[PDB]
């Protein structure tokens, strides 16, 4: 599913992401936009054999099992396929686990590049949340 921006904001807000580990909602909408363009089915193959999955583009070397990633750990304890569903429940749960590590939201390259230190008001503008 390709989420609408406000539709995504409402689902994140409803799932307790606004302030999760000190990361306000606009942070999460901005990273989703630059990481996958709000598409839950996005996938990206990396040069190291790992693949990024879903709306948050979670990497298979560390967080999920895709069965073809060498030296993988699967910390979220899931199949990467579960990160591609229209339903965000597993993705949100795994994203919550990722931000608890030492690097926080800095784990996402798109956040570091396009969201970090920026004015993120426009990402939730007009959503009513
Ligand atoms: C959201 C997701 O899956 N993010 C993970 C991620 O994913 C990517 C995915 C795509 C790219 C692309 C296209 C380019 C580029 O330059 O870097 C990337 C990192 O890779 C890093 C790189 O190692 C993982 O960070 C590493 O993850 C674990 C988990 O906390 C730590 O133990 C390490 O310390 C930490 N490595 C470093 C050096 O930051 C982080 O989790």
Swiss-Prot record:
InterPro entries: Glyco_hydro_22 (IPR001916), Glyco_hydro_22_CS (IPR019799), Glyco_hydro_22_lys (IPR000974), Lysozyme-like_dom_sf (IPR023346). Transmembrane segments: none annotated. Keywords: Antibiotic, Antimicrobial, Bacteriolytic enzyme, Disulfide bond, Glycosidase, Hydrolase, Secreted, Signal. GO terms for cellular component: extracellular space. Optimum pH is 4.5-5.5. No activity above pH 8.8. Disulfide bonds join 6-127, 30-115, 64-80, 76-94. GO terms for molecular function: lysozyme activity. SMART domains: LYZ1. The active site is at 35, 52. Residues 1-129 form the C-type lysozyme domain. PROSITE patterns: GLYCOSYL_HYDROL_F22_1, GLYCOSYL_HYDROL_F22_2. It is found in: Secreted. GO terms for biological process: defense response to Gram-negative bacterium; defense response to Gram-positive bacterium; killing of cells of another organism. Its EC number is 3.2.1.17. It catalyses: Hydrolysis of (1->4)-beta-linkages between N-acetylmuramic acid and N-acetyl-D-glucosamine residues in a peptidoglycan and between N-acetyl-D-glucosamine residues in chitodextrins. Optimum temperature is 33-49 degrees Celsius. Retains 25% of its maximal activity after heating 10 minutes at 80 degrees Celsius. Belongs to the glycosyl hydrolase 22 family. Lysozymes have primarily a bacteriolytic function; those in tissues and body fluids are associated with the monocyte-macrophage system and enhance the activity of immunoagents. Has antibacterial activity against the Gram positive bacterium P.citreus. Has no antibacterial activity against the Gram negative bacteria E.coli and Y.ruckeri. Does not have hemolytic activity against trout erythrocytes. This is Lysozyme C II. It comes from Oncorhynchus mykiss.
